[PDB]
Symmetry: C3
Subunit: 124 residues, 3 copies
């Protein structure tokens, strides 16, 4: 079972490249990292920085996540990234993406590895 | 000094059984899992699923925690559980419980393991 | 690369001393613990308790952190600690601190180890 940390690396790390090589970059990446295996992940971002650099962000500026959790951290400096967003016509199994390169700060959610149960909140 | 993860297992996991086999299930389990040694724990639920299944809930749907932390996750599917609630006359050293078998989504709070001090927030 | 757990032990743990052994303790300590290498850290506290005693706080009373994060806990018992506040005259590389012994409850922020990225939340 791939861990969440491992899956983050497969889905969002692309350290061997400095920017998107072309407009088709997202079509080739979404596919090779298996993000189109059984559905078209709608939107996905790849970071062109070293793993050490993205990992250090868990020690940078704390910010609340879009969902409210308090384990999100924003990078102190900008990083090269590529957003991949499914086009209007894309329909599994014919997933199509638009590639958008940019250089912005990133926000990642962090957790211990492993992350296990320690309290029983309730049953619903 | 039992770890919090091991304590959750002792207090909440009963994998070897599919459901409560009797109404005295709670009196027997609260006693054998040492939940009546330090006082009568008022309420406690046991999950009849694999350690793998329960551990995977830490990666399922994030939901609000009754205590306000942002580390609660609800299981995508229902699981067989056994709620143990102290009877009206229960009182240490004669703890007694009502057994209620059910099928419900469970909500557990998750944490890294080990889970250590990383910042000094304040003194009070 | 020093871990976050390790950096805490180095900046806030002083287990070999039951309390500030002199009013020059902060001046010595702030230097020996490298909190004066690049600049003089404004304020810092040391906890005169074993490491286990402090690690045990991650299981104690959950209280909000100064920044709103929900991973802070307050010790049930008060502890022997030392506040080090930089004197207004202090100017790097001449770091002068005012030492102040105290017996207070400590509040620490806790995380898993390792603590790594698991979701890409946004780019700002």
């Amino acid at each position: 079972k791939e861990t969440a940390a491992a899956k983050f690396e497969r889905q969002h790390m692309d350290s061997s490249t400095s920017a998107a090589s072309s407009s088709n970059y997202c079509n080739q990446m979404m596919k090779s990292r298996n993000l189109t295996k059984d559905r078209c992940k709608p939107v996905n971002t790849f970071v062109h920085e070293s793993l050490a650099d993205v990992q250090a962000v868990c020690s940078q500026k704390n910010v609340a996540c879009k969902n409210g959790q308090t384990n999100c951290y924003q990078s102190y400096s900008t990083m090269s990234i590529t957003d991949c967003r499914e086009t209007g016509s894309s329909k599994y199994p014919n997933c199509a993406y638009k590639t958008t390169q940019a250089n912005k700060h990133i926000i990642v959610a962090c957790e211990g590895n492993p992350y296990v149960p320690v309290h029983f909140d309730a049953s619903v």
